[PDB]
Design a protein around this ligand. Structure first.
Ligand SMILES: O=P([O-])([O-])O[C@@H]1[C@H](O)[C@H](O)[C@@H](O)[C@H](O)[C@H]1O
Ligand SMILES: O=P([O-])([O-])O[C@@H]1[C@H](O)[C@H](O)[C@@H](O)[C@H](O)[C@H]1O
Ligand SMILES: [Ca+2]
Ligand SMILES: [Ca+2]
Ligand SMILES: [Ca+2]
Ligand SMILES: [Ca+2]
Lengths: 252, 252
């Protein structure tokens, strides 16, 4: 299965999902539909989003790990998918919530060949493959801000940082794409509770990688080990090559 | 002048400035076109939207307090104006930025008689008159649980909080409407080195209060006798009556 397969496939889910959510009223969006396979509740929006993706991913020889219903599939290709990363905003009318998909051969991130995040509010498309990282087509790349005094996304500010700006938009998959497109110089989820799963960073992380930004874990150990599994958790420190180090040191 | 004209005038300015920025590519958006009369530099998206905004207000008998052109016109009626709140977003294509407008029968916040916030990204409309606060033509109210374990907007987390969620979206006018909505449980701008100006907040402040909100300065002092000029600087703590005291002590 080509990257062109993954892209073609990915382009279908986003649209299917988009109008499934779009048609959905905020009132019929926030109600809970049960308990997804990862411990967290499940809103209607959640269900509707995942179904539309599964119905298409379903026809592909792929094993999928996803929030609402753990593992599914069998294929020799794995998908770390999130129908709706940023469910709080979506149920709020806040226009920052996306579809996340990452395509890999093996069980682990290291063998992933395609990244794709789609903002379902705006219709903004984020993707990456061997060719590169794009947003709405135009080629992107992380920023070259070399100063700790810079624009940042931080989960969560706990001390007093030397940041020019600090934002928190509530959709890790999308904000990693904000880091990816140079709109932001560093992504940071140093949350002690290590409350970040694979179907969250998977897609985002990989586009960031393509866009030219170094991305690892709290200490610096890569994300490679990471598995398309329901137990996997993580923290992230993302920045170009001249920022990541200093950004590490600053959180000791 | 009454709250019907303010709406009608505001609705027009919302149309033109919307037209203005939308057709305008991002490249130009980020363009430095000189310095504004307040320090915070003027970029093309700024200039483009003030221009559009000013072009309408000025043919009314009012004194305008705007970001770039300082104070303008004459009239017992005052208008605090943020022609583009969330410039950084507007420049990067992050769909949170608005046009903020507050009208008062005095230069005093306390005499405000109309408030208005328009998401230039989603065409989402917030306003507040004598009848109540509304969002896209619907009546909003603030949220209601006194538990600190709530959903907060806070500029900036310097310590450790008992909040369920912390978001910073970079447009205080709209964010104060996010609070006024129900979307977020509390708004807080406790930054010591104060940076909120009358125009970024007087509208939100006014829509939130009609929303059922309690906005006061850091110390719980009302924002009533707050002046419309390029010197005022604010700190804000907004929430329902019940959780407001709590937040004071929390950040006490
Ligand atoms: O809640 P969700 O919308 O499914 O996804 C959330 C977003 O990625 C958020 O940015 C992150 O910090 C949270 O940990 C995730 O749970
Ligand atoms: O610059 P501007 O976009 O007009 O207004 C800014 C926004 O309201 C932002 O939320 C706030 O944190 C800044 O302090 C303001 O300067
Ligand atoms: Ca999700
Ligand atoms: Ca998620
Ligand atoms: Ca402005
Ligand atoms: Ca402003």
């Amino acid at each position: 299965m080509d990257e062109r397969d993954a892209l073609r496939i990915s382009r279908e889910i986003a649209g299917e999902v988009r109008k499934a959510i779009a048609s959905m009223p905020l009132r019929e969006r926030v109600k809970d539909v049960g308990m997804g396979k990862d411990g967290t509740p499940t809103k209607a929006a959640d269900r509707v989003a995942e179904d539309a993706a599964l119905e298409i991913l379903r026809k592909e020889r792929v094993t999928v790990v996803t929030e609402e219903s753990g593992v599914l599939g069998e294929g020799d290709v794995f998908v770390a998918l999130d129908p709706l990363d940023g469910t709080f905003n979506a149920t709020r009318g806040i226009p920052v919530y996306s579809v996340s998909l990452c395509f890999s051969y093996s069980d682990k991130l290291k063998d992933a060949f395609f990244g794709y995040v789609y903002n379902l509010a705006t219709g903004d498309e984020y993707y990456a493959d061997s060719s590169g990282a794009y947003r709405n087509g135009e080629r992107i790349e992380v920023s070259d801000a070399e100063e700790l005094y810079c624009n940042a996304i931080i989960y969560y500010p706990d001390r007093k940082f030397p940041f020019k700006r600090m934002r928190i938009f509530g959709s890790a998959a999308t904000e990693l794409c904000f880091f990816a497109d140079g709109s932001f110089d560093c992504f940071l989820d140093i949350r002690p509770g290590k409350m970040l799963r694979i179907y969250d960073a998977a897609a985002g992380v990989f586009i960031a990688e393509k866009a030219g930004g170094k991305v690892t874990e709290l200490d610096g150990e890569s994300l490679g080990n990471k598995k398309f599994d329901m137990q996997e958790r993580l923290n992230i420190v993302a920045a170009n090559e001249k920022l990541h180090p200093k950004l590490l040191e600053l959180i000791k």
